[PDB]
Design a protein around this nucleic acid. Structure first.
Length: 201
DNA sequence: CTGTCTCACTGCG
DNA sequence: TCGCAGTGAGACA
């Protein structure tokens, strides 16, 4: 109910803290114990003509039959597990939005990262928001306008994403802005991030 | 003078 | 330690 609003041209996002420390810690410990991450062939992506192992771990859970493809990699959902349904249900309650798929990214420390991109794949429902819930170490998240990488002097938006927090990325954020989690060498602890999405069957 | 796009890396500064 | 430029091998429209 108290949201920090993050707005610029084409940028509509909202940030809030959902869980206090003790609850967040408990959810984190459960995610650590319960989440199974893809390995090997399901952990390699193709970008700029080259194949790379992803510098983090990824997992996908969601309703049966759906798929999510990005960067030459196709991920299939594992069935929902209790800790994930709990988070999904809490997020639906607070936002009034629904989700049928989640991508989980785990950054073991500040050297694990994710390069900039847009979540704009064809199989995301038009106009649907992405809910980004974070546990573990706080890490800086960066929004960058697509015509500044240059054409326009539009400033980056930076914010720390804290333990137990929710970042709502609403349309049209993903049409107009790239996001990333840059390397932060001083961060030593892991971070687990869940991005709940609505996927087209 | 003039196509768009890249969930990743190295090579700088 | 951080952030930026240029990819790179295509696949498009």
């Amino acid at each position: 109910h108290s949201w920090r609003h993050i707005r610029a041209e084409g940028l509509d996002s909202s940030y809030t803290v959902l869980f206090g420390k003790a609850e967040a810690d408990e959810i984190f410990q459960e995610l650590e114990k319960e989440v199974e991450y893809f390995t090997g062939a399901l952990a390699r992506v193709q970008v700029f003509g080259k194949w790379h192992s992803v510098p983090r771990k990824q997992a996908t859970y969601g309703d049966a039959g759906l798929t999510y493809t990005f960067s030459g990699l196709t991920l299939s959902p594992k069935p929902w597990i209790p800790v994930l349904e709990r988070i999904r249900d809490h997020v639906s309650g607070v936002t009034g939005q629904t989700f049928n798929f989640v991508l989980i990214n785990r950054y073991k420390d500040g050297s694990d990262h994710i390069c900039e991109h847009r979540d704009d794949e064809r199989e995301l429902a038009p106009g649907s928001p992405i809910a980004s819930v974070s546990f573990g170490a706080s890490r800086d998240f960066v929004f960058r306008h697509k015509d500044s990488r240059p054409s326009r002097r539009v400033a980056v938006v930076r914010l720390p994403l804290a333990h137990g927090s929710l970042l709502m990325m609403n349309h049209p954020t993903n049409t107009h802005w790239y996001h990333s989690l840059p390397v932060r060498k001083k961060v030593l602890a892991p971070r687990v991030n869940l991005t709940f999405r609505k996927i087209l069957l």
